[PDB]
Design a protein around this ligand. Structure first.
Ligand SMILES: Cc1cc2nc3c(=O)[nH]c(=O)nc-3n(C[C@H](O)[C@H](O)[C@H](O)COP(=O)(O)OP(=O)(O)OC[C@H]3O[C@@H](n4cnc5c(N)ncnc54)[C@H](O)[C@@H]3O)c2cc1C
Ligand SMILES: NC(=O)c1ccc[n+]([C@@H]2O[C@H](COP(=O)([O-])OP(=O)(O)OC[C@H]3O[C@@H](n4cnc5c(N)ncnc54)[C@H](O)[C@@H]3O)[C@@H](O)[C@H]2O)c1
Ligand SMILES: OCc1ccc2[nH]ccc2c1
Ligand SMILES: [Mg+2]
Lengths: 1214, 107, 54
């Protein structure tokens, strides 16, 4: 039985002083990085003047010397027409036979009806063509605008414009974006510039392997290219002759620090084999630099390769360092030292860096201390020049390669390097089809007589467009190449010296004013929770120790009553991934003590209510600080108790911290003396988010002024007990927060207790239904229903069309379906693939599935942990076997023998014939896949809605028409576009569904606290200027009927309603997070009087709903002669169970009528209904007798606006 | 169509062009339900025409037009209202319904 | 272009024939100029051989 965390994340090798200096700089504050860079980049006044003169000369030559622009001009194309034309040209070039393409153009395309002859939107890559035509990036494509534009331009200009577009696109995609379609073509085309003194480095365009098969394909592409390049090099050697550039992410599908052992065992030999071939031909082999979290891992490969005697005698190994990265100079120190130790003259390509916007987004998403890159472009420029000075001092041991298109950067380095030059000392580098105009002013004895190596992409149209967006942005407003073409930018501006500009700033190295540090995403509202960087060796080393220390602790969970811990039945809590690992001990609550706890809560309710809201919120904020400080220990407990990986656990603790701070801030924004607490609230929580949901429900109830009976799931009491201990330490009195560990009997005893004033339940729909039935017999002392928030299961779908990028889909599917072994309520259950792409995506998905590591979660390398119990395992496996027995195709990972000591289900993909193959939620790592024809998309959305669930939903498409269609027709609480579907960032994706998935209001949203007080406050930003038109028609009808007071109440409800609220919530860059209030659906109205009916109808119509009115009320004659608009929304129901599902109910009557109606409502099939009841007198006295907060439905939509490959808004940030 | 607007010239030719900026990403939901109904009854050509009408309709276009500062000049396309349909054949009726529903109208 | 250049003379006629003030006569001529230029531009954006006249 292996000791917990004994092998959590050991480094590849002990970290040397040089390696530790790299890690120390990972997220160093920008103000600390810059001063040494300024010093190192400083040059004499004579050199600065000479450099500016050289830069001006180069820039004057550049400006003194278009294809798409000329086409746009000749045919008077709008921007959309230009984009549409290039998309058409791209599609026409997918026709191989040139004569067949020309015949289609002349006979069919030119005569209109291009739609008839061209499963895949023509405009799939329009975001890329948009960048080409307009210089602006859009994440998604307005395909209807492009279709209109294409029709218009073809009808106006005919075949000649199509011909010109085809020839333009052929030239760009075959000769500009790539040096050649194949390595042989690229080599033939390289002779011209090689004869002028250029060299080449070829890039076979491999990147981000998703499967073993992809990695093998990219391997054989590199190997075949090395042969072709080496044959062509013909002994020219590594400096004069061509080389190759490779990306490590192309060569293994799990290239990450978490998988370091697989990287060293499996990726390293592949690089070695390629390097051995490059050695034999004596060509350069350069390792390109990728994301910041791969930098230090790549150094371990570089170290092994440079120390491997089989590669000795060859100096062609190359390595890129990114000057936008804070570690760059320390990486260079490490590399220079490695070159000295190994005796290999490492080729070092200095670049600025290609992943800037992605690094900003990632650090914000992960809540990390700072960015691993600079945030002002001028800082990167200074870093580059400082790093060039370091490289130029070490030309005896490394070969510097200065990759840049910036004439100022170039000139600074040209003069820094001095007049002594020989081929092999250093070189410049540029990108094919971008840098030649500059470097034709550099290469050759008649220029600066310095060599330049051209980075030459090689590949087909399909491969080229995959990452052209990122490549073009390298096009942003701050980019030299964009600025050189901007007439408003003077040469003096372009030759400005970044070193002297930085040195003269008030605070040297200050962060960009318009980029939030991750902690500051929410500004003054609250402090973002902080995560942990699992790529940082210092963090991993410290976390290893804290995790081991957590496993030595004697964790317990006890019934913590107001009067002290109570005795009870005690049992061990076992690690679900290894039952031999005892995590702690739980003492469970007797049903007698549960009832006693509620009475103690009732007695303590006035004292807790009297704590001012701001002080209650201060307790939550203190608890959040305590949880943040204790995060490493909390991670260890969550990892061992609940089967979570470290990443799962970090998310869990961050979410708890965010709930605490969010509900604290919402309280400070809203709660006053008139928002009285309900009283004792029973908080019943699920095992699968054993700290986050647990803490969220309790914190909300407490801060609203209610004492809480906290009943954690029987599977996960220890982390709940620790959360209670933390809240109590933060100042929540023991009488206000009692912990009652135990199973559903303890929950049921709490729900049934006489003084229970509200229930917050998160768990399965079936259990929520039992609670709903229990509460249907109950009324408050005021004779009103006991509020129930019941957040329940999902049957969550993702729809993927033929415009989505398969690699992006597969990553988001693997994460959404199998993160936490599918034990997220948000997990993807049903993937819906458009038929034309289904086979390709499914193949990639199955390949990615088999790269997952399943096991006990106290290892960083484990992706997928166990299921929580043997009963959960048996239930999941029974479902899989039923599917397999029906003949459905089932793909499963093979599990290691070590899983036998725990309860594991392998990640599973099941191919369904119809969505009806699924019944209820299967809460495990089981992804179902269905295929759909594009024309059946609307029926498919109906089918998704027809399950009755409505929790999370994903859509992967680039096409605005499809986004608009799908998102308007889907009925789910949390929508995600071009990303995973498991996001629940508090206050950013307020989380919670509808139908079988929830009553609402959403946790982590602004309506939540208002449900926990007797009179709901007005939430921040909660209003709408829109008035429902059917409400208005009803108000006029009421006036025409003479119901004057009711017409006024109807108008007031129309104004009070927040239906139509449409907000963007602050969050990370590269995402848009939207929050909207819609109608709930059909509200069941159970009136008693005519006026009550009119008030109920006004409330429901003002919130956009339709209604079914109880026909047994006998009030049909009160609704004669309705306007058709209102009549369309009104039905009369004699059999309520036949006319559902409803989305809520409004009831009028005395206490016993309300109770009887509540029992009938609870008995209706399907979703739990949020019922509001009032007496006739309350309707007369209180305009808010029916609260409109609970008659609208919250919808959160999270859109990944970086999905096209770049961030448009950040293109203006430099 | 409005004088001084982008639909005007198209009324003065026998086949209307696609005006500048004339498109919408919105699809009328009743149109979509009608297309599904046509699908169900095997009216494949009409269902296709209905989906095509749903896409080519510019119902929901909502543009800000260039003009002077200190003013916002908006141009939007709404349903006309109730369209009188005078069909002769079942297929003609389905096509007329598709056209009218795709543009947000009742009939 | 001709209406723009001749606007002062056109104003005189509009003022006397149609009871317009100078400002409203200016608006009248400007609107005619704008129709001409707008329909010209809309034509350049749209009309091709398949859009036959009535
Ligand atoms: C031959 C060659 C090989 C390359 N290999 C790689 C590689 O392996 N890995 C890699 O990551 N990229 C690589 N690049 C790209 C390089 O990193 C740059 O993205 C690109 O060349 C633009 O830099 P520039 O100096 O030519 O132009 P510039 O316009 O001078 O610099 C633009 C760069 O500034 C940086 N930047 C922009 N905005 C900000 C900001 N707000 N804060 C901080 N920094 C900012 C970015 O790095 C951006 O690319 C390569 C480029 C070339 C020409
Ligand atoms: N909508 C959401 O936000 C959300 C979030 C997380 C989990 N969930 C759902 O939670 C479920 C998984 O959690 P789980 O397995 O712990 O759920 P569950 O329904 O098994 O148990 C939930 C809680 O209810 C208690 N309970 C069981 N029977 C009870 C009864 N008769 N009366 C009162 N309480 C009773 C349990 O002890 C536990 O505390 C999944 O269905 C998942 O989709 C929903
Ligand atoms: O990550 C590798 C990479 C990224 C961006 C680039 N641009 C030009 C070459 C190049 C290489
Ligand atoms: Mg259970």
């Amino acid at each position: 039985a292996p000791a917990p965390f004994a092998d959590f994340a050991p480094p590849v090798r002990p970290q040397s002083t040089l390696r530790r200096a790299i890690t120390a700089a990972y997220r160093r504050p920008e103000t600390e990085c810059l001063p040494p860079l300024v010093e190192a980049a400083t040059q004499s006044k004579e050199i600065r003047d000479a450099a500016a003169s050289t830069a001006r000369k180069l820039i004057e030559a550049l400006r003194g010397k278009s294809g798409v622009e000329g086409l746009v001009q000749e045919y008077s194309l709008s921007s959309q027409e230009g984009v549409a034309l290039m998309c058409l040209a791209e599609a026409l070039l997918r026709i191989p036979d040139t004569a067949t393409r020309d015949a289609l153009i002349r006979d069919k395309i030119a005569d209109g009806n291009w739609k008839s002859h061209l499963s895949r939107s023509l405009f799939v890559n329009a975001a890329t063509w948009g960048l080409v035509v307009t210089g602006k990036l859009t994440s998604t494509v307005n395909d209807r605008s492009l279709a209109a534009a294409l029709t218009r331009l073809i009808s106006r200009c005919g075949e000649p414009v199509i011909r010109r577009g085809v020839d333009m696109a052929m030239r760009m995609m075959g000769e500009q974006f790539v040096t050649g379609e194949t390595i042989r073509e690229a080599l033939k085309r390289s002779k011209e510039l090689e004869e002028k003194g250029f060299s080449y480095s070829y890039d076979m365009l491999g990147e981000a392997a998703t499967t073993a098969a992809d990695a093998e394909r990219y391997y054989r592409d590199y190997e075949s290219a090395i042969h072709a390049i080496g044959k062509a090099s013909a002994g020219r050697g590594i400096y004069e002759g061509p080389g190759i550039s490779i990306k490590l992410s192309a060569l293994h599908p799990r290239y990450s620090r978490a998988q370091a052992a697989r990287v060293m065992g499996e990726l390293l030999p592949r690089v070695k084999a390629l390097a051995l071939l490059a050695k034999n031909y004596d060509i350069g082999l350069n390792i390109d630099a990728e994301e910041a979290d791969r930098l230090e891992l790549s150094l371990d490969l570089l170290e092994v390769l440079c120390l491997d005697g089989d590669l000795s005698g060859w100096n062609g190994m190359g390595f890129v360092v990114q000057a936008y990265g804070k570690r760059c100079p320390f990486v260079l120190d490490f590399i220079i030292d490695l070159a000295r130790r190994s005796g290999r003259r490492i080729m070092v390509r200095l670049v600025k860096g290609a992943y800037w916007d992605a690094e900003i987004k990632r650090a914000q998403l992960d809540g990390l201390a700072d960015f691993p890159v600079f945030t002002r472009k001028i800082h990167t420029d200074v870093s580059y020049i400082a790093c060039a000075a370091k490289l130029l001092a070490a030309t005896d041991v490394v070969f510097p390669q200065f990759a840049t298109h910036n004439a100022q950067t170039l000139a600074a380095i040209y003069h820094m390097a001095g007049k002594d030059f020989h081929v092999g000392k250093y070189e410049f580098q540029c990108l094919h089809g971008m840098g030649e105009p500059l470097y034709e002013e550099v290469v050759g004895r008649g220029k600066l007589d310095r060599p330049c190596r051209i980075y030459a992409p090689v590949g087909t149209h399909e491969t080229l467009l995959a990452y052209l967006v990122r490549r073009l942005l390298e096009g942003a407003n701050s980019s030299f190449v964009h600025r050189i073409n901007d007439p408003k930018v003077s040469i003096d501006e372009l030759i400005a010296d970044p070193v002297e500009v930085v040195r003269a700033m008030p605070v040297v190295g200050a962060k960009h004013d318009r980029i939030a540090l991750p902690a500051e995403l929410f500004g003054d509202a609250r402090t973002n929770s902080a995560g942990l960087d699992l790529s940082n060796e210092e963090t991993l080393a410290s976390l290893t120790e804290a995790l081991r220390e957590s496993a030595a602790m004697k964790w317990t969970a006890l019934p913590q009553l107001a009067t002290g811990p109570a005795a009870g039945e005690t049992r061990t809590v076992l690690n679900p991934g290894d039952h031999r690992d005892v995590v702690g001990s739980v003492t469970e609550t007797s049903e007698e003590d549960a009832r006693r706890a509620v009475r103690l809560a009732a007695d303590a309710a006035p004292d807790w209510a009297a704590v001012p809201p701001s002080e209650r919120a201060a307790c939550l904020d203190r608890a959040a600080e305590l949880m943040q400080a204790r995060m490493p220990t909390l991670l260890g407990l969550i990892i061992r108790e609940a089967g979570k990986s470290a990443l799962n656990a970090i998310a869990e603790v961050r979410e708890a911290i965010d709930f605490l701070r969010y509900y604290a801030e919402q309280t400070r924004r809203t709660l006053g003396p008139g928002h009285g607490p309900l009283g004792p609230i029973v908080c019943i929580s699920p095992w699968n988010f054993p700290l986050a949901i647990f803490t969220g429900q309790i914190a909300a109830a407490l801060v609203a002024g209610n004492p809480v009976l906290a009943k954690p799931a029987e599977e996960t009491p220890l982390i709940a007990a620790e959360g209670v201990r933390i809240l109590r330490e933060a100042g929540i009195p023991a009488s206000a927060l009692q912990l009652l560990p135990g199973d559903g009997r303890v929950g049921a005893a709490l729900v049934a207790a006489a003084e229970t004033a509200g229930v917050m339940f998160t768990g399965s729909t079936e259990v929520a239904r039992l609670i709903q039935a229990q509460l249907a017999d109950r009324l408050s002392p005021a004779g009103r229903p006991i509020p129930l928030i019941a957040e329940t299961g999902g049957q969550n779908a993702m729809i993927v069309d033929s415009s989505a990028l398969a690699e992006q889909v597969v990553g988001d599917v693997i994460t959404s379906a199998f993160d936490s072994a599918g034990q997220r309520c948000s997990a993807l259950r049903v993937l819906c693939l458009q038929e034309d792409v289904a086979d390709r995506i499914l193949t990639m998905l199955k390949g990615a599935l088999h790269e997952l590591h399943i096991g006990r979660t106290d290892r960083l390398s484990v992706d997928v942990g166990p299921v929580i119990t043997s009963e959960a395992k048996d239930n999941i496996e029974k479902h899989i076997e039923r599917m397999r027995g029906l003949g459905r195709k089932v793909e499963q990972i093979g599990l290691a023998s070590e899983t036998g000591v725990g309860t594991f289900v392998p990640p599973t993909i099941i191919e369904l014939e119809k969505l009806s193959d699924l019944q209820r939620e299967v809460f495990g790592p089981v992804l179902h896949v269905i295929r759909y024809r594009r024309d059946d998309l609307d029926r498919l959305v109906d089918d998704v809605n027809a399950t009755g669930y409505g929790l999370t939903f994903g859509l992967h498409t680039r096409l605005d028409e499809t986004i608009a269609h799908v998102t308007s027709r889907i009925k789910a609480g949390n929508l995600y576009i071009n990303r995973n579907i498991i996001g629940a960032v508090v206050g950013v994706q307020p989380f919670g569904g509808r139908g079988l998935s929830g009553t609402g209001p959403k946790a982590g949203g602004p309506l939540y606290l208002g449900r926990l007080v007797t009179t709901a406050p007005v939430p921040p930003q909660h209003s709408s200027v829109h008035t429902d038109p059917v409400l208005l028609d009803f108000a006029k009808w009421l006036d025409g009927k003479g119901a004057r007071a009711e017409a006024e109440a109807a108008r007031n409800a129309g104004s009070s309603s927040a239906l139509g609220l449409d907000l963007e919530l602050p969050g990370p860059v590269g995402e848009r997070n939207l929050y909207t209030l819609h109608a709930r659906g059909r509200i069941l109205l159970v009136p008693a009087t005519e006026s009550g009916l009119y008030h109920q109808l006004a409330a429901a119509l003002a919130t956009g709903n339709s209604v079914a009115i109880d026909a047994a009320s006998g009030l049909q004659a009160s609704l004669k002669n309705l306007p058709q608009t209102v009549g369309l929304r009104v039905s009369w129901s004699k059999d309520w169970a036949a006319d559902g599902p409803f989305a809520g109910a409004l009831v009028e009557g005395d206490a016993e009528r309300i109770r009887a109606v509540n029992k009938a409502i609870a008995a209706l099939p399907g979703p739990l209904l949020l019922v509001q009841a009032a007496s006739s007198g309350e309707i007369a006295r209180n305009p808010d007798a029916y609260c409109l907060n609970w008659l609208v439905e919250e919808v959160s939509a999270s859109i990944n606006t970086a999905a096209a490959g770049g961030n448009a808004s950040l293109m203006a940030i430099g």
